[PDB]
């Protein structure tokens, strides 16, 4: 029993990080097989990250300008390129520590984990969800650039994220490993804001599901209601629409708990129109949304 | 900025869960030079949950009742010893992934990260604070007992829990790496239960800190507090006892924000008098007690 916000085990990636310097700029890497992956911007200074030419910047740079350090050893930089707002270190060594991994892009709505480090030395793990408007809500101080987000589907290591900069309404924007950005956001000191978030509805209703499994069942009624019906009220309260998709992914949880998708919208209906009446669930006072349908059926079976 | 319950890395933990089995129950064990620690309750059997007697249970099994797994090996046990209520089995093979390690008993109120594993492999990772009632709220189901509980304040793993029940409340109770339990629970199948439990105020108070270190400041109030009228309040709503000890602990964060402990007790006082009337702190609408003054420091500043 219990349900607690969980993160995948970090052992596999912490064998991957390296710290990355350049000029005065130390960020963190990414070292996999014979190359290291950090944020372009380590190769900027204050007034370059005004508006910066990363081109014109780079082609400026001999490898031996990066110094590339694995817990105490140097690693040799062989060769450096860009791919979108990513730089790719070639180093002489491969990791030995390499696991078996694949570069992702995930979609809003969908989790992981964060293993945050300085000075190329993992120091948390925690487990985020990519918001609807492309931010996390990661907790992160200077140093930190290039930790990165992951998943762990067997023994693959699936990457999705890595930290590129905070935003000033405190929330964190990053891209996919391939150095595409989640969100309209430019790795270059201008003014830049999250737009209006809204709640994840499926990871909502998973989250209801948790608590159905482990006992908090107060919320239960005996209506129902229509996808329609239900859309209507989610886009009133800055809710997600739900999908069919969404609808067919809660389908094992509809089957254990004997609460029809539409049956838990109508609980949500009612929580959403009425609020929780000073009760709790699963010890929040607030709806989360930062568990996927999956996260529930692993924690609560596997 | 942005504040998370985060756990501390386990990567040096991982490489020490083991699968330990005798007869029909597998359970996990934690691998550390030459041994392997687990729960003494894995040589009970079905009859024996009532009322064990351990010392003879355990002197009926040789080393090779034990089968110890570490991924895809067997290790050879060749020794047994209990201490307390943990089984210790001595193996051939030291652990070459032994990290720098050392025991240490908790008191409540600290915090610590759970590696949950079955069948000797890790599934997750979370963060757990040992409650004023000697339990603890984590996640675990059949097959978790022998995870671990865990800090890494430098290079160095301090163990500090091994999980060995579930209690009817839903909550989780275990021992140190000595084998002794927390609070007043026994590794038998009797009825025991959960004190009531109290929230733990010196927590609270250093995540309100954290709160205006991260630039929120809704909550604070123009009054002040005797630490005694503090603990006359807070008791009405359940809230642990707040000692000098707790005072002078939340010192460096009392130093860094500008607010007198005193002062944030009186904040406290009012927050649990009003609620939260529709706002959050640090993205939560309930009053936080799973981080310490020294979880605030690592994080924030
Ligand atoms: O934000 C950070 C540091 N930090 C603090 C917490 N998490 N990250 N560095 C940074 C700031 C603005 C920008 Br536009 C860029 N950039 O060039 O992409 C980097
Ligand atoms: O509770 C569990 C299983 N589990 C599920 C989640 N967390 N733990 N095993 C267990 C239960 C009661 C007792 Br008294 C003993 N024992 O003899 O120590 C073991």
Redesign the pocket.
């Known amino acids: 029993s219990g349900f607690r916000k969980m993160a995948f085990p970090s052992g596999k990636v912490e064998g991957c990080m390296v710290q990355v310097t350049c000029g005065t700029t130390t960020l963190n890497g990414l070292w996999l097989d014979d190359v290291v992956y950090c ?1 372009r ?1 380590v190769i ?1 200074t204050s007034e370059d ?1 005004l508006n ?1 030419n990363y081109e014109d910047l780079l082609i400026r740079k001999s490898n031996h300008n990066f110094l590339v350090q694995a817990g105490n050893v140097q690693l040799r930089v062989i060769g450096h390129s860009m791919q979108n707002c990513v730089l790719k270190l070639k180093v002489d060594t491969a990791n030995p520590k390499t696991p078996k991994y694949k570069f992702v892009r995930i979609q809003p709505g969908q989790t992981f984990s964060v293993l945050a480090c300085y000075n190329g030395s993992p120091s948390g793990v925690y487990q985020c969800a990519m918001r609807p408007n492309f931010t996390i809500k990661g907790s ?3 140093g ?2 290039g930790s990165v987000g992951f998943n762990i589907d067997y023994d693959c290591v699936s990457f999705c994220y890595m ?4 935003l000033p309404t405190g929330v ?1 924007a990053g891209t996919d490993l391939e150095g595409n950005f989640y969100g309209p956001f ?5 003014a ?1 804001a999250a737009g209006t978030d809204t709640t994840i509805t499926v990871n909502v209703l998973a989250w209801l599901y948790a608590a159905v499994i482990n006992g908090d069942r107060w919320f239960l009624n005996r209506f129902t209601t229509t996808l329609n019906d239900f859309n209507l009220v989610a886009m009133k309260y800055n809710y997600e629409p739900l999908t069919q998709d969404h609808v067919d992914i809660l389908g094992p949880l509809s089957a254990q708990t004997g609460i029809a998708v539409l049956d838990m919208c109508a609980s949500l209906k009612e929580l959403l129109q009425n609020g929780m009446n000073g009760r709790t669930i699963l010890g929040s006072a607030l709806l989360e949304d930062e568990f996927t349908p999956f996260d529930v059926v692993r924690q609560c079976s596997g």
């Open positions: 944020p911007h900027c990250m910066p992160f101080l200077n930190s650039c930290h590129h900069m905070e964190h430019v790795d270059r000191q201008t830049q």
